[PDB]
Design an enzyme around this catalytic site. Structure first.
Site, PDB file in Angstrom:
ATOM      1  N   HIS A  74      17.499 -49.704 -50.038  1.00 51.02           N
ATOM      2  CA  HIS A  74      17.695 -50.026 -51.250  1.00 51.02           C
ATOM      3  C   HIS A  74      16.874 -51.094 -51.835  1.00 51.02           C
ATOM      4  O   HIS A  74      16.745 -51.788 -51.170  1.00 51.02           O
ATOM      5  CB  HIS A  74      19.213 -50.142 -51.768  1.00 51.02           C
ATOM      6  CG  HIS A  74      20.003 -50.836 -51.873  1.00 51.02           C
ATOM      7  ND1 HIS A  74      20.525 -51.567 -49.972  1.00 51.02           N
ATOM      8  CD2 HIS A  74      20.319 -52.243 -51.862  1.00 51.02           C
ATOM      9  CE1 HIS A  74      20.771 -52.464 -49.995  1.00 51.02           C
ATOM     10  NE2 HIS A  74      20.614 -53.080 -51.805  1.00 51.02           N
ATOM     11  N   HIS A 119      17.022 -53.403 -55.366  1.00 48.78           N
ATOM     12  CA  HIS A 119      17.234 -54.023 -57.213  1.00 48.78           C
ATOM     13  C   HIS A 119      16.566 -54.107 -58.358  1.00 48.78           C
ATOM     14  O   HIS A 119      15.644 -54.949 -57.673  1.00 48.78           O
ATOM     15  CB  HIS A 119      18.310 -55.186 -56.875  1.00 48.78           C
ATOM     16  CG  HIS A 119      20.138 -55.193 -56.038  1.00 48.78           C
ATOM     17  ND1 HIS A 119      21.040 -55.165 -56.075  1.00 48.78           N
ATOM     18  CD2 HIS A 119      19.441 -55.979 -54.131  1.00 48.78           C
ATOM     19  CE1 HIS A 119      21.679 -55.247 -55.166  1.00 48.78           C
ATOM     20  NE2 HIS A 119      20.214 -55.737 -54.191  1.00 48.78           N
ATOM     21  N   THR A 179      25.166 -58.848 -52.017  1.00 51.16           N
ATOM     22  CA  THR A 179      25.322 -58.882 -52.808  1.00 51.16           C
ATOM     23  C   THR A 179      25.319 -58.234 -53.761  1.00 51.16           C
ATOM     24  O   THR A 179      26.145 -57.930 -55.473  1.00 51.16           O
ATOM     25  CB  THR A 179      23.694 -58.998 -53.441  1.00 51.16           C
ATOM     26  OG1 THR A 179      23.728 -57.696 -53.380  1.00 51.16           O
ATOM     27  CG2 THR A 179      23.019 -60.302 -52.235  1.00 51.16           C
ATOM     28  N   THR A 180      26.773 -57.175 -53.929  1.00 50.70           N
ATOM     29  CA  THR A 180      27.554 -56.174 -53.870  1.00 50.70           C
ATOM     30  C   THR A 180      29.054 -56.205 -53.265  1.00 50.70           C
ATOM     31  O   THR A 180      28.959 -56.090 -52.529  1.00 50.70           O
ATOM     32  CB  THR A 180      27.677 -54.282 -53.468  1.00 50.70           C
ATOM     33  OG1 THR A 180      27.635 -54.013 -52.640  1.00 50.70           O
ATOM     34  CG2 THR A 180      26.161 -55.032 -54.803  1.00 50.70           C
TER      35      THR A 180
HETATM   36  N1  LIG Z   1      27.964 -51.665 -47.644  1.00 50.73           N
HETATM   37  C1  LIG Z   1      27.569 -52.813 -48.216  1.00 50.73           C
HETATM   38  C2  LIG Z   1      26.241 -53.407 -48.354  1.00 50.73           C
HETATM   39  C3  LIG Z   1      25.077 -53.478 -48.023  1.00 50.73           C
HETATM   40  C4  LIG Z   1      24.347 -54.326 -47.959  1.00 50.73           C
HETATM   41  C5  LIG Z   1      24.344 -54.917 -49.596  1.00 50.73           C
HETATM   42  S1  LIG Z   1      22.351 -56.230 -49.891  1.00 50.73           S
HETATM   43  N2  LIG Z   1      22.807 -56.127 -51.601  1.00 50.73           N
HETATM   44  O1  LIG Z   1      23.846 -57.282 -49.822  1.00 50.73           O
HETATM   45  O2  LIG Z   1      21.720 -55.717 -49.005  1.00 50.73           O
HETATM   46  C6  LIG Z   1      25.506 -54.510 -49.832  1.00 50.73           C
HETATM   47  C7  LIG Z   1      26.204 -53.954 -49.678  1.00 50.73           C
HETATM   48 ZN   LIG Z   2      21.653 -54.731 -51.947  1.00 51.81          ZN
END
Ligand SMILES: N#Cc1ccc(S(N)(=O)=O)cc1
Ligand SMILES: [Zn+2]
Ligand SMILES: N#Cc1ccc(S(N)(=O)=O)cc1
Ligand SMILES: OC[C@H]1O[C@@H](O)[C@H](O)[C@@H](O)[C@@H]1O
Ligand SMILES: OC[C@H]1O[C@@H](O)[C@H](O)[C@@H](O)[C@@H]1O
Ligand SMILES: OC[C@H]1O[C@H](O)[C@H](O)[C@@H](O)[C@@H]1O
Length: 257
Positions: free
Chosen positions: A91, A93, A195-196
């Site tokens: 994904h 941001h 980070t979420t």
């Molecule tokens: N479940 C879950 C989750 C996976 C990856 C991330 S990140 N933004 O740290 O890549 C955040 C939440």
């Molecule tokens: Zn992320």
């Protein structure tokens, strides 16, 4: 529930996720002068040739491209990693404007966006078990700057109109994530967190030094997505990034001299 707005964004998350104020939260600012070359790092291996993408989902926070992680196909090994980490999803941001959007920063500079390729340590058998372990996850982070178009991103861009709102998904088979990488695998690494929410402290971060270039038109299409569900008042999906968090008792290591 949590989000990125004034009333449910990063400054509020700690009330339901107290680890938000923890000892190894992400993202962080990468001070390139203090980062140190680490000779103990082994060569990094990004092995995506057999990746099996499945689906793309608007989850109300970003969009995830999901992979078959039922067997060792697309994996990440080497570098700071002990063992094999299977790709489960990627994904991004991004910002409302090109001057912001990344989660990590480089000498405080914010990029327009940041790609996260999320992997789990196969010794723990499933993702849920991996996120109960200090070394459960590895996230490969790649900065995006605006310039020339990234051909390997266009298939993603072109499906977004079909997943505009929260809860919509579409088939996304036969996508090759190798087309999202830069040329160089030089990187910085440090131990951190999701980070979420739930902000779990399970992640070995591997952040590539070389950004990829994407076109303005490509990132503008990210910004046409919606945080809201179908029928609900339109809230553009922009500024879905957490700011840098305190480094605390950590060091950032570099793969390059
Ligand atoms: N479940 C879950 C989750 C996976 C990856 C991330 S990140 N933004 O740290 O890549 C955040 C939440
Ligand atoms: Zn992320
Ligand atoms: N109403 C409401 C509400 C506000 C913030 C959050 S938090 N701590 O997850 O950001 C959750 C619910
Ligand atoms: O279709 C996307 C990718 O899927 C992989 O499983 C194939 O082995 C690659 O050759 C192809 O580029
Ligand atoms: O005690 C010296 C050691 O300090 C640590 O903080 C550094 O990570 C090492 O690179 C260094 O050799
Ligand atoms: O590779 C990801 C996707 O790219 C394009 O949308 C193709 O039309 C679709 O068949 C494929 O699933």
């Amino acid at each position: 529930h949590w989000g990125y707005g004034k009333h449910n964004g990063p400054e509020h998350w700690h009330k339901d996720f107290p680890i938000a104020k923890g000892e190894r939260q992400s993202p962080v600012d990468i001070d390139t002068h203090t980062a140190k070359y680490d000779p103990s790092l082994k060569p990094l291996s990004v092995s995506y040739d057999q990746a099996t993408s499945l689906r793309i989902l608007n989850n109300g926070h970003a969009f995830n491209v999901e992979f078959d992680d039922s067997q060792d196909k697309a994996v990440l090994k080497g570098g700071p990693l002990d063992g094999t980490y299977r790709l489960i999803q990627f994904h991004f941001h991004w910002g409302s404007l090109d001057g912001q959007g990344s989660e990590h920063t480089v000498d405080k500079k914010k990029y327009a966006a940041e790609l996260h390729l999320v992997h789990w340590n196969t010794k723990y058998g499933d993702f849920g078990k991996a996120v109960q372990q200090p070394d459960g996850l590895a996230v490969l982070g790649i900065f995006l700057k605006v310039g020339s178009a990234k051909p390997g991103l266009q298939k993603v861009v072109d499906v977004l109109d079909s997943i505009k709102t929260k809860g919509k998904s579409a088939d996304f088979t036969n996508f090759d994530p190798r087309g999202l990488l830069p040329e160089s695998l030089d990187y910085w690494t440090y131990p951190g967190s999701l980070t979420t929410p739930p902000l779990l402290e399970c992640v070995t971060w591997i952040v590539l030094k070389e950004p990829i270039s994407v076109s303005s038109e490509q990132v503008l299409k990210f910004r046409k997505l919606n945080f809201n569900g179908e029928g609900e008042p339109e809230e553009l999906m922009v500024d879905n990034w957490r700011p840098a968090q305190p480094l605390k008792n950590r060091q950032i290591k570099a793969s390059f001299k």
